[PDB]
Amino acid sequence: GFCWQHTCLPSGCADFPWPVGHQCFPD
């Protein structure tokens, strides 16, 4: 999962800028 504004949403992918890149959060 991924947290946004302390609200944690389900596992998924998010596109971050370089060099973090496209991250996928299984939790």
Number of domains: 1
Looking at how many chains there are and whether they match, the oligomeric state comes to monomer
- Helical amount among residues, as a percent range? under 10%
Strand content: over 45%
The main sheet orders its strands as 1-2
The H-and-E topology, N to C, reads as EEEE
Number of helices: 0
- Cα-to-Cα separation, first versus last residue: 4 Å
Shape: flat
Largest sheet, if any? 2 strands, antiparallel
- Alpha-carbon Rg, integer: 9 Å
Which structural category fits the helices and strands? mainly beta
Annotation, overall tally of beta strands: 4
PDB class: plant protein
Keywords: Cyclic, AEP-processed, bi-disulfide, plant protein
Assembly: monomeric
Entry title: Solution NMR Structure of PawS-Derived Peptide PDP-24
Describe the structure.
- The PDB classes it as plant protein.
- Keywords: AEP-processed, bi-disulfide, plant protein.
- It forms a monomeric assembly.
- Solution NMR Structure of PawS-Derived Peptide PDP-24.
- The chain has 27 residues and is an all-beta fold.
- It is built from no helices and 4 strands.
- The relative contact order is 0.34.
- A hairpin with a 2-residue loop joins strand 1 and strand 2.
- It has one domain (1-27).
